Write a structure and sequence with these properties.
By secondary structure, the protein is α+β, with helices and mostly antiparallel strands. Helices cover 28% and strands 36% of the residues. It has one domain (1-75): 2-Layer Sandwich (Alpha-Beta Plaits). The chain has helices at 19-25, 51-59, 70-74, and strands at residues 4-12, 30-38, 41-49. It binds 7-methyl-guanosine-5'-triphosphate. This is Poly(A)-specific ribonuclease PARN.
Length: 75
Amino acid sequence: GPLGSDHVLHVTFPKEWKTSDLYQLFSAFGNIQISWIDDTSAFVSLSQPEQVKIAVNTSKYAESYRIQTYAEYMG
Ligand SMILES: C[n+]1cn([C@@H]2O[C@H](COP(=O)(O)OP(=O)(O)OP(=O)(O)O)[C@@H](O)[C@H]2O)c2nc(N)[nH]c(=O)c21
């Protein structure tokens, strides 16, 4: 939630495309939801892992090491 960012994007494509094409196109992402606009366009919402935030968060589970952002290091 803080570990993944939610995005909505706009996609234009050929009329011949189906749901599966958009799922394939965005397969690098999580929680993909298509909101069709018309024959050749859709909004797509998705979740993108935030690898830096995840590395920081995961460090809390280890006593031996801690990762923090430069901002947290300051504050
Ligand atoms: C499923 N689908 C929907 N559209 C466009 O979106 C309009 C309404 O889409 P719809 O009534 O077929 O599904 P809806 O979006 O309501 O619900 P969903 O299937 O659960 O997402 C259609 O009139 C088309 O213009 C689509 N357009 C293309 N090109 N390919 C598709 O597979 C497709």
